[PDB]
Design a protein around this ligand. Structure first.
Ligand SMILES: [K+]
Ligand SMILES: [K+]
Ligand SMILES: [K+]
Ligand SMILES: [K+]
Ligand SMILES: [K+]
Ligand SMILES: [K+]
Ligand SMILES: [K+]
Ligand SMILES: [Mg+2]
Ligand SMILES: [Mg+2]
Ligand SMILES: [Mg+2]
Ligand SMILES: [Mg+2]
Ligand SMILES: [Mg+2]
Ligand SMILES: [Mg+2]
Ligand SMILES: [Mg+2]
Ligand SMILES: [Mg+2]
Ligand SMILES: [Mg+2]
Ligand SMILES: [Mg+2]
Ligand SMILES: [Mg+2]
Ligand SMILES: [Mg+2]
Ligand SMILES: [Mg+2]
Ligand SMILES: [Mg+2]
Ligand SMILES: [Mg+2]
Ligand SMILES: [Mg+2]
Ligand SMILES: [Mg+2]
Ligand SMILES: [Mg+2]
Ligand SMILES: [Mg+2]
Ligand SMILES: [Mg+2]
Ligand SMILES: [Mg+2]
Ligand SMILES: [Mg+2]
Ligand SMILES: [Mg+2]
Ligand SMILES: [Mg+2]
Ligand SMILES: [Mg+2]
Ligand SMILES: [Mg+2]
Ligand SMILES: [Mg+2]
Ligand SMILES: [Mg+2]
Lengths: 206, 146, 102
RNA sequence: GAACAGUGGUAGGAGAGCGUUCUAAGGGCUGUGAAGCCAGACCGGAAGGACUGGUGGAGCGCUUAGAAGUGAGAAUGCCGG
RNA sequence: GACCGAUAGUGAACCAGUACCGUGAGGGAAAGGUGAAAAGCACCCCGGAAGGGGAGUGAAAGAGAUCCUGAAACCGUGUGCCUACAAGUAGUCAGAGCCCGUUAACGGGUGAUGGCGUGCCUUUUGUAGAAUGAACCGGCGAGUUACGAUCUCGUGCAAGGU
RNA sequence: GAACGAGGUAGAUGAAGAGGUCUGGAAAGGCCCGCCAUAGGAGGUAACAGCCCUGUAGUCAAAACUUCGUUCGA
């Protein structure tokens, strides 16, 4: 699709034609849901455990004889109904990761990119280039592009100065073209992407 | 999508049933297991195929046959699949495998005679059905064994 | 601590906000200081061997060190603290002016 | 929306929901008083939900989705009173 | 860290492998929170003291050490309605009288008297059961997870899929 | 055996608001304004702090002991 091309300073240098196979598909909402859920599950560390009745300290002996005392029969002071007892079926360390088919992954990232173009929240830049790695300059650039809220900045390769300048601004994330991903795209209002990065994204996804 | 307005595909996700959580649910108390007996017990139930001591079906019936060490399975290709190639193509196992017409070679390609072949082809395969050889030669082509 | 016994400071936070005084004592371990005329308390002391009258007594209670700032020598306004080395000897400097504090 | 019919129920099958803790994203509330607690003649078909006042003195809802140590009146249950 | 938050999480947030138990091997607890700061209540009064009542401090003392909150059982003080001719699974529906006055509703409290009415749970052909379980209140306390299988539903791609 | 380099075992330096004003026991909160940011990790501070403190990013540092690296007969 046809989109305005901008400079850093915020002046429009004509238009650029984004590949329709990437930026012009009908977004598959069910696929994007699945990709978001899958990606958030991948982030979980899953480090959680309880002690069952075997793992709690002590508890070997029968607390009192089976018959004759008038008490309920009990097998261990760490049986699960005892205060201080083992837990029945609590958490155990585990992974929550699973893989979607590679074609579903392709669809999902195309969907959210193509949805950014519909919502007019893509900003293609001629190039993005800071003289000094200075946060004040990045903040000025984002002001100029009318980037009020959160934004994902996508460069073709690692750009140390852009990375460093945006690092400390809240809700701005810098990423290489390789590093683009569904959750980062959907969780930033504006997508600032360089023309070099657009070409690099198209290369892979188309 | 927006992370604040996520919505699963209708019919993609159901709520799990949680038994033994009160009478209103319809699986309170006995948790759907009925009353007593081996099937209601924790860890309970007889092993698969057990018939409570009646001689199990598998044990009533005789073992049959043997397995050949040297069994050959061929990747079979019917004539309809050869129809997808270009005219005058030298169809080989390596091409079939590369194009994705077959997934695994196994003992070799065998050509079988299901469907119709219009296109003339030089088919090189390990085996042919009598039908398939005839059908390849009838279309003008060649059925070389390799 | 960024201030020490004898420093003139301004109280920047509390009931005594905007009150200047001298640090009478520092308590590094608690990160508190005692500032003259600041954070006065009425201690109800019984008769002892030392003071056999007893009575209620107005004394300073210490405040958190992060509620005081040293004053800039030049302007007389609160300053943050830096360190430079003069004559092979480290000194505190008012970040506001550049002037040495001590 | 109309008509017509139906709606006792144990084991049990099926469905639709309520509430709890945590997370993410919106959005909010709160020292001009959060949660909790106490009280009331309010609201919803139920699970339940508000509002007002008191106590309390710093945290907490809401929406959508996710994940579960997710709901107790009984076990001569365990611990405390 | 879509792990715990003081019955949890380590047995152990605290002087815990302690105290305590056992000849011994060994078993094995309970017990966190004044306040921002001790400013931890000078002084007066009752009392032998404990403990109070003032006065002070403090935002707060009904934050005073048994010190954040402060439920329930349980124990009391006061009193609006009822109660000493009555036969009671204790309610429910009917109902005067008396006392009140609300999230304002064909309201609230009490209840002479009338009708009806054998708790709950478990287990049973059948339980008010003279069968079982629970003194009461509170907290804790039971279909989970992993890896495989299969079916339904959903999605992607499709003679291919991965 | 030495030399050199990078580490470890202490540390050092380190930007920017007591901004005004409201409520309050207290302001880190509200409202209205600034500013720093290779630093908006964290903890603390009389309520919730990038700019109050300890710090953080970055940049430096070792007498001594120690780790690793580098160099010096078909
Ligand atoms: K069942
Ligand atoms: K309240
Ligand atoms: K019980
Ligand atoms: K314990
Ligand atoms: K009656
Ligand atoms: K009996
Ligand atoms: K401070
Ligand atoms: Mg054991
Ligand atoms: Mg016996
Ligand atoms: Mg435990
Ligand atoms: Mg079911
Ligand atoms: Mg049933
Ligand atoms: Mg039951
Ligand atoms: Mg049973
Ligand atoms: Mg039976
Ligand atoms: Mg059965
Ligand atoms: Mg500083
Ligand atoms: Mg009926
Ligand atoms: Mg809570
Ligand atoms: Mg549970
Ligand atoms: Mg109980
Ligand atoms: Mg507690
Ligand atoms: Mg414990
Ligand atoms: Mg002994
Ligand atoms: Mg109170
Ligand atoms: Mg408090
Ligand atoms: Mg208390
Ligand atoms: Mg009579
Ligand atoms: Mg009478
Ligand atoms: Mg009778
Ligand atoms: Mg019988
Ligand atoms: Mg029995
Ligand atoms: Mg009994
Ligand atoms: Mg410094
Ligand atoms: Mg407070």
């Amino acid at each position: 699709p046809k989109v305005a091309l901008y400079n850093q300073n915020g002046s429009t240098a004509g238009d650029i034609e984004l590949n329709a196979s990437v930026f012009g598909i009908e977004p598959n909402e069910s696929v994007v849901f699945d990709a978001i859920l899958m990606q958030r599950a991948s982030l979980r560390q899953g480090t959680h455990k309880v002690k069952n009745r075997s793992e709690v300290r002590g508890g070997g002996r029968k607390p009192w004889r089976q018959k004759g005392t008038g008490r309920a029969r009990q097998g261990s002071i760490r049986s699960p109904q005892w205060r201080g007892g083992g837990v029945v079926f609590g958490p155990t360390p585990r992974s929550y990761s699973y893989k979607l088919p590679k074609k579903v992954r392709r669809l999902a990232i195309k969907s959210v990119l193509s949805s950014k173009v519909i919502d007019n929240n893509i900003i293609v830049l001629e190039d993005l280039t800071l003289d000094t790695a200075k946060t004040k300059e990045m903040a000025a650039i984002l002001k100029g592009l009318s980037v009020e809220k959160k934004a994902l900045i996508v460069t073709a390769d690692a750009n140390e100065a852009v990375a460093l300048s945006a690092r400390n601004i809240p809700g701005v994330t810098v990423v290489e073209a390789n590093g683009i991903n569904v959750l980062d795209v959907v969780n930033h209002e504006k997508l600032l992407i360089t023309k070099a990065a657009v070409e690099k994204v198209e290369e892979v996804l188309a | 999508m927006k992370l604040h307005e996520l919505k699963p595909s209708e019919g993609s996700r159901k709520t799990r049933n949680r038994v033994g959580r009160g009478i209103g649910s319809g699986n309170g108390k006995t948790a759907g297991k009925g009353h007593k007996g081996q099937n209601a017990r924790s860890g309970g139930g007889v092993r698969p195929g057990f018939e409570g001591g009646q001689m199990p079906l598998f044990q009533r019936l005789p073992k049959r046959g043997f397995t050949n060490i040297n069994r050959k399975e061929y990747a079979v290709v019917n004539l309809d699949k050869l129809n997808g190639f270009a005219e005058g193509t030298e169809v080989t196992p390596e091409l079939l495998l590369e194009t994705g017409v077959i997934s695994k070679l196994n003992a070799g390609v065998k050509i079988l005679g299901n469907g119709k072949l219009e296109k003339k082809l030089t088919v090189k395969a390990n085996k042919f059905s009598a039908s398939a050889k005839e059908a390849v030669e009838a279309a003008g082509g060649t059925a070389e064994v390799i | 601590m960024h201030v020490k016994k004898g420093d003139k400071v301004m109280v920047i936070s509390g009931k005594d906000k905007g009150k200047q005084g001298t640090i009478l004592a520092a308590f590094p371990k608690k990160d508190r200081v005692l500032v003259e005329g600041v954070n006065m308390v009425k201690k109800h002391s019984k008769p002892t061997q030392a003071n056999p009258q007893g009575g209620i007594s107005n004394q300073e209670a210490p405040i958190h060190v992060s509620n005081v700032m040293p004053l800039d020598p030049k302007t007389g306004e609160v300053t943050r603290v830096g360190y430079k080395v003069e004559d092979g000897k480290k000194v505190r400097v008012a970040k506001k002016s550049g002037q040495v504090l001590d």
